[PDB]
Amino acid sequence: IFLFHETVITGLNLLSAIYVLLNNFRNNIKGLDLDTIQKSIIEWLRETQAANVNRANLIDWLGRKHGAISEIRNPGLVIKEINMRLSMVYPDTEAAAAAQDRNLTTETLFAWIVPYVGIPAGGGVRPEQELAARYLVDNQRIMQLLLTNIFEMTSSFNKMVQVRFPETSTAQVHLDFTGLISLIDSLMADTKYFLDLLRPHIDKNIIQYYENRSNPGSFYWLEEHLIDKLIKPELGLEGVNQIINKTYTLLTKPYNVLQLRGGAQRRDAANIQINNNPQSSERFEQYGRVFSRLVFYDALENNSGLRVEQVALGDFRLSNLIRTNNAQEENTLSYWDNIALRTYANVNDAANNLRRYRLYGSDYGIQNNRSMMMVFNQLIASYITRFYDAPSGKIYLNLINAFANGNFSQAVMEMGYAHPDLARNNNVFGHRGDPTEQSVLLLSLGLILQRLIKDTNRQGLSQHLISTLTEIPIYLKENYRANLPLFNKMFNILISQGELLKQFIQYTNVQLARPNLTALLGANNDSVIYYNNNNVPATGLSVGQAALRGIGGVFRPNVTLMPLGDAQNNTSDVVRKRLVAVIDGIIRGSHTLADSAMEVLHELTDHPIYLETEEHFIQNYMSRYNKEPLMPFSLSLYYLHDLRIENNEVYDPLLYPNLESGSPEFKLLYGTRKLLGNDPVQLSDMPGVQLIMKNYNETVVAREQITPTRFEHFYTHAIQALRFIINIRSFKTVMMYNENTFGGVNLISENRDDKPIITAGIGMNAVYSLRKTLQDVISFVESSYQEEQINHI
């Protein structure tokens, strides 16, 4: 009964979770199927009357099936918005410098294609219909969602799902699923094996309840939907890969070009025509804005597309260190009062008017600004916050030494090598140029770390630093144990995202040009930050930009921020070098902090045993109750619970490294820390898994017993599946702009028509941890009365 729960039900829940993710992945990729979208648009133009040529009619069309051409789940997401200013996507193909380019929108294109509806006598596609298939599709949105979905899915660990680039004639991108497929076969075989073994001792009704194909989440239901209709054919996984490749190829292929000039008086007049003499850059869709947003920010949109409201510096716990010298000295952090005479605001107006752009926070995890740079800086913020003990006012030096005194000593000790996230009030974030490899750290966090390394008391001794581990409080070492692995894994997720983006940029022909930013925004060609007819030069000499009294500004030209520039400063080659530079900076910082986290962890006497709620919990439980606490592997599946949604994006507080020692969330993280990691898990690292095995073999006779190799194999496959699922939904997905993506879908439901893992309803087949609260799980472990918990199961 207990063993059945721990083997059959656990394996069925894990396989069902794998199916949910794979099926949602399939639906998303089908939703971004560019081959179908283009062919359907051409068919629409072939079969539509001239009067019905409008975006509404096409949206209705794509929502329907037309012969072999499949419907699209969400037509409006992949067709350009009606008023999308076309110069926002196609670089200067456009003349953004006029008030006539303003009347040039997708509406103009729909008005331009009216005369080229219908089929020529030959039956072949019109050239205009091929141009319409290109220019009417929101290609940038497709590329963004495709990249994000792939990046959520990519699972190089355990060689599960590997994104390989075979650069042949097609712009080839392949998702090798062999590892995940072999793992699915393995867990299905193990699930069937324990079913066969336990059939004689379990009620026939229970076995049929977990086997009958009509019951969702049963073994044979999975054998139908997960294997027969997904892994090995409905659209199979290899067909999904085909659509991924074809879509990416179609996104990056050469096309014929239109001359997008227009605007007689309104948006239904066309100076548009075929351009049979195009520049090379126009034959290719450009995705510089998309990649920019993925890395740091998309400067073209309001506030560079970020959520950056000016807040008092004291919103952050460590605001007293957003400073320039010791606490007892006179602060010099200020802002430019007048640029003509280069005067600084005085102490009072500086301390009262200075605001921080809220790109990170101390009280929450990653919940906004899911770009690589801002995720990176928010992780640093939480890092310093969690490990700086306020009552003592100390942080362990080895945590930050390599970062602030080593690889990133420039961003912390020198000025200009950080993004300026401080300014006087009534100065919005605005439209901001590209950072460099050396300005991916937020200036505010750099100043904090500078204060952490350098601050000294009146006797010259270090103010904030503890030099030896022996003097770290106990609970803080517990916090180390539980949170440092999360920090390492997350900085490595950033590294993996950056390296994979680099492989896409390098091993495919994608063009990464930006539009004519200065024309669209009306900014100066020397402007490094522009917002509402204010031009911030690369010197940073603008009223309100942060500065240091008596020394100068926080901007270093050609380092802090690049000019936003015109189309010529926004070519695919240029933006390519800029994106890769920012990526490399993120990667270097993440490597350094991750190595430091592991270094401090290695110095600690860390022997994680599965579901110890705290140090020495097992031995003390044995001492008090003379028995070994129940720690079934099933409880780890609690992490498969529904993620939290905020502003349509998932996050997971349970699996964010800001947890506090002794809390229930912390106890789960402390118990499952090696299980969440990437290291092999031996069966002695899970003592309750070994005890349930021994207790079942003591009852059954030789023929029906289990080998420590069959148990080791099942659980190796149980570990891998759980890690694959968790790494998708709670990490890769959470650390990226994930709206309209598959990674964060709920795996659980109380409706069996909704999900194959059914909790608290007709068809309920979920493990104990998915039907109960976290407190129930922790007490499941820490209760003396084991018989009543076994009675629960």
Numbering used by the authors: 2 to 93, 96 to 236, 249 to 808
Show the paper's wording.
From the outside to the inside, the virion of ASFV has an outer membrane, a capsid of viral protein p72, an inner membrane, an inner capsid that is approximately 50 Å thick, and a nucleoid of the dsDNA genome and viral protein complex. Proteolytic cleavage of pp220 produces p5, p34, p14, p37, and p150, while proteolytic cleavage of pp62 produces p15, p35 and p8. Among these, p150, which contains residues 894 to 2476 of pp220, is the most abundant virion protein (in the percentage of the virion protein mass) after the major outer capsid protein p72 (15–17). The inner capsid is likely assembled from the proteolytic products of pp220, with p150 as the major inner capsid protein.
We then chose p150△NC (residues 267 to 1101) for structural studies. The elution volume of p150△NC from size exclusion chromatography (SEC) indicates that p150△NC is a monomer in solution. We obtained a crystal of p150△NC that diffracted to a resolution of 2.4 Å. The phase problem was solved by molecular replacement using a model generated by AlphaFold. The final atomic model of p150△NC contains residues 268 to 1074. The two molecules in the asymmetric unit have similar structures, with a root mean square deviation (RMSD) of 0.188 Å. The structure of p150△NC has an open-sheet shape resembling an upside-down triangle, of which the thickness is approximately 38 Å and each edge is approximately 90 Å long. The structure of p150△NC is rich in helices and consists of 5 long helices, 23 short helices, 16 310 helices, and a few short β strands. A DALI search for homologous structures shows that the structure of p150△NC shares no structural similarity to these of other proteins or the known viral capsid proteins, suggesting that the structure of p150△NC is likely a new fold for the assembly of viral capsids. The results showed that the hexamer of ASFV p150△NC could be fitted into quasi-6-fold positions of the map, with a mean CC value of 0.46 and a similar orientation to that of the Fp150△NC capsomere.
